[PDB]
Design a binder for this molecule. Structure first.
Ligand SMILES: [Zn+2]
Ligand SMILES: [Zn+2]
Ligand SMILES: [Zn+2]
Length: 585
């Protein structure tokens, strides 16, 4: 017994072909079963034929006879069809409203999440269907991980390098950082975890959390977890106030945070607020200074990733009383300078999926581009706050969507917060980039910030661009452009001071090749988000949709504090680079 995801009419019916088994009222359930392939209906019991050795589960072919369900062949003389009168039979039949169109639900219920239009629909449908979509998507993503074959340690060639044997008949997952495995130790009659691991083409290079002397027989699977059902909306109802509500500003602030005072007051004058903070504009500084501006307020700092929460902890360690802070960790090495798992402390730092059920004066949700609607709903389910502040940048990278193959996901569809920020605009905008040379700031300001992002630094004269297609090779799931790496090598010989640079590319296999040929530390754009370096050398590698993505390209070039060299494949983005052009030797 539950509530119909389209009507909220009370019902005893859940669609049993939908992987999330959502409640559907007599009408909506009927309109759903008759217009799709979904025919299994679940009640207090399942609408299935109770005959001995019968296979009929289709609700339109079943009858309630006695107090059992039967198909036409096995029904008793007295019975009535379960699925008739434009309605499916179950409890609470009289209270039932129906919907004019079941079209959005059916599409969410039946899609395979490989078309961009699936995520577009999932972020523009009714709020209740946003929750059903976010569950259905995340369950589908978790199930797809089970499709991958087990990888088994066949030979330990060295330390940090292995030799894997793969399960027959199942595909192999890509070997990049977006796929984290878990080892398992072979035992008497079961298995135990041995940490979480990542792999890369060698043999295979493995970068695991904890070191071991792992030997043959150990194996790796992308660890899955149970997806819980959602209840809270992705955003609470907005409320605007005429005075600061539930918060008491300090009367003495320092000139370190004075630039944020007006925004801090805005935070107290509405129920939720959105803060767009481009690279290097002071997002964590903003978030910690909020605590100092409202020194009595209890604040929960949250984000999806442990690294994002830790970075808030590192900023709070600099400005806030360590005794008033606590890092929540469920039973990976994270921040360990606060007391652990103290929910009732004034400042709580905790990832979304480990959040306790509690209240707070302010909730700060950081790196919001990386959130999904599932995360948005979970936060609202766990935390009841006077104020919610969503901090991030819809021009930076989103959570990877593994199932998506047809079409690109635009920032307004990353999640509900990003949609608001791209349609009505963010409540607050951090307009001055303190990190990057002006050539880089001017580029991304025009590229993704509607010319609103201003530079703090001057031009460095150390931002260069080269147009060089090179030669693209592919391995199992990545791309390599050795001629672009050769161009960088020739550049380094003539400019050896650039050997303090970090090498960045959109592809892990490109980085592996560059690490060996150049010796520079390497980062994928996606892994570099949130970090900064004095000098960056970037090879676009290809012109794909992946390597030309403007959020990825924005993140890539905004890692640099002083200088950057971009070897570009795409003529488009090359022409957009307000960098000094260099010639190919
Ligand atoms: Zn309904
Ligand atoms: Zn269904
Ligand atoms: Zn039967």
């Amino acid at each position: 017994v539950g509530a119909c995801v389209l009507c909220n009419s009370q019902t005893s019916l859940r669609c049993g072909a939908c992987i999330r088994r959502p409640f559907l009222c007599c009408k909506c359930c009927y309109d759903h079963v008759i217009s799709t392939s979904h025919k299994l209906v679940l009640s207090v019991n399942p609408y299935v034929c109770n005959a001995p050795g019968c296979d009929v589960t289709d609700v339109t072919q079943l009858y309630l006879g006695g107090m059992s369900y039967y198909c036409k062949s096995h029904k008793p003389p007295i019975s009535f069809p379960l699925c008739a009168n434009g309605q499916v039979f179950g409890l609470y039949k009289n209270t039932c409203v129906g919907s004019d169109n079941v079209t959005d639900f059916n599409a969410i219920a039946t899609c395979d999440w490989t078309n961009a239009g699936d995520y577009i629909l999932a972020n523009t449908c009714t709020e209740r269907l946003k929750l059903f979509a976010a569950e259905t998507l995340k369950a589908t993503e978790e199930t797809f991980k089970l499709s991958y074959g087990i990888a088994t340690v066949r030979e330990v060639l060295s330390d940090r390098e292995l030799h894997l044997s793969w399960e027959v008949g199942k595909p192999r997952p890509p070997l990049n950082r977006n796929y984290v495995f878990t080892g398992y130790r072979v035992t008497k009659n079961s298995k135990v975890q041995i940490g979480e691991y990542t792999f890369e083409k060698g043999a295979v290079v493995y970068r695991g959390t904890t070191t071991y002397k792992l030997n043959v027989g150990d194996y790796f699977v992308l660890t899955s977890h149970t997806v819980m059902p959602l209840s809270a909306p992705t955003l609470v109802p907005q409320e605007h106030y005429v005075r600061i509500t539930g918060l008491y500003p300090t009367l003495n602030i320092s000139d370190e945070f004075s630039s944020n005072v007006a925004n801090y007051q805005k935070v107290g004058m509405q129920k939720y607020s959105t803060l767009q903070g481009p690279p290097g504009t002071g997002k964590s500084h903003f978030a910690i200074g909020l605590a100092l501006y409202y020194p009595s307020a209890r604040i929960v700092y949250t984000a999806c990733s442990h690294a994002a929460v830790d970075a808030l902890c590192e900023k709070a360690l600099k400005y806030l009383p360590i005794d008033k802070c606590s890092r929540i960790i469920p039973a990976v090495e994270c921040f360990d300078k606060f007391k652990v798992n103290s929910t009732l402390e004034q400042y709580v730092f905790c990832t979304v999926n480990a959040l306790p059920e509690t209240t707070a004066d302010i909730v700060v949700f950081d790196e919001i581009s990386m959130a999904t609607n599932y995360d948005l709903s979970v936060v609202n389910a766990r935390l009841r706050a006077k104020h919610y502040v969503y901090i991030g940048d819809p021009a930076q990278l989103p959570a990877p969507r593994t199932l998506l193959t047809k079409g690109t996901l635009e920032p307004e569809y990353f999640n509900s917060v990003c949609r608001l920020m791209k349609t009505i605009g963010p409540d607050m905008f951090l307009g001055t980039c303190r990190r990057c040379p002006a050539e880089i700031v001017d580029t991304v300001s025009a590229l993704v910030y509607d010319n609103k992002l201003k530079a703090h630094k001057d031009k460095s004269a150390q931002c260069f661009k080269m147009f060089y297609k090179g030669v693209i090779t592919h391995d199992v799931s990545s791309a390599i452009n050795r001629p672009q790496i050769g161009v960088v090598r020739e550049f380094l010989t003539r400019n050896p001071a650039w050997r303090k640079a970090v090498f960045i590319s959109p592809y892990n296999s490109q980085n592996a090749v560059a690490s060996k040929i150049l010796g520079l530390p390497t980062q994928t754009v996606d892994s570099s988000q949130g970090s900064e370096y004095d000098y960056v050398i970037f090879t676009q590698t290809t012109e794909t949709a992946h390597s030309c993505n403007v959020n990825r390209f924005n993140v890539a070039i905004t890692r640099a504090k002083v200088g950057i060299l971009c070897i570009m494949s795409d003529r488009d983005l090359y022409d957009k680079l307000q960098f000094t052009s260099l010639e190919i030797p």
